[PDB]
């Protein structure tokens, strides 16, 4: 009965969209339907972070970050709880 107005993805005025592959399970998904996450992580936790600090030369050191940009399919994404199941009215709430 057409539970979603946009059909589960954001595509308009196009015929075809190229796919990408799930970062967890390898499945093919169109790029306009996969859920995207961008991560800015540290290399280590804070205790090891301070342990590196006084083992270091230069007296002023900052650890680098990591940049990842992962992408998931519906099944592999809501099994990990990046996305959950909502009610009929709450589904329409973007942002």
């Amino acid at each position: 009965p057409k539970k979603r107005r946009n059909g589960g993805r954001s595509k308009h005025n196009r015929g075809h969209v190229n796919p990408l592959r799930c970062s967890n399970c390898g499945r093919c998904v169109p790029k306009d339907k996969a859920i995207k996450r961008f991560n800015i992580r540290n290399i280590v936790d804070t205790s090891a972070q301070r342990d590196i600090k006084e083992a270091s030369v230069y007296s002023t050191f900052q650890l680098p970050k990591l940049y990842i940009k992962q992408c998931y399919c519906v099944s592999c994404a809501i099994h990990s709880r990046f996305v959950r199941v909502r009610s009929r009215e709450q589904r329409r709430v973007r942002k």
Partner: protein, 133 residues
């Protein structure tokens, strides 16, 4: 060697963590002339736990002992995450290896991530519909 007073001697430690093992490989600062390689899987016997923090800690302790034996007193760090068409994040052993190296007694030079990302993408294993569990 024959270092001058209070002067540090440097080497490069290539770390590899791959969800199945942890390599700790120390060379000089040109890449050639390897010095130590303890790789984690020489510390346990269960055919698992090779990626556990415990094995990485033991390997780092062995590396620190040998490096002090040889005369090297400082280390540059390069981190790798096995990232070709395979996974992009490092495994559970990298943090333990870094912490053991830091608390060993050596001096830490610099840290960098060198995972081989492609702009290219040959096709990925486990064809469409993915790895089904």
């Amino acid at each position: 060697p024959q270092p001058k007073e209070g002067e540090l001697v440097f080497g490069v430690a290539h770390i590899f963590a791959s969800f199945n093992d942890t390599f700790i490989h120390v060379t000089d600062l040109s890449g050639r002339e390897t010095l130590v390689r303890i790789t984690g899987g020489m510390k346990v016997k269960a055919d698992r736990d090779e990626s556990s923090p415990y094995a990485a800690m033991m390997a780092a302790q062995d590396v620190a002992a040998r490096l002090k034996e040889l005369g090297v007193t400082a280390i540059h760090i390069k981190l790798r995450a096995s990232g070709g068409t395979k996974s992009k994040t490092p495994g559970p052993g990298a943090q333990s290896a870094l912490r053991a190296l830091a608390r060993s007694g050596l001096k830490i030079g610099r840290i960098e991530d060198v995972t081989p990302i492609p702009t290219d993408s040959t096709r990925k294993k486990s064809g469409r519909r993915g790895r089904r569990l």
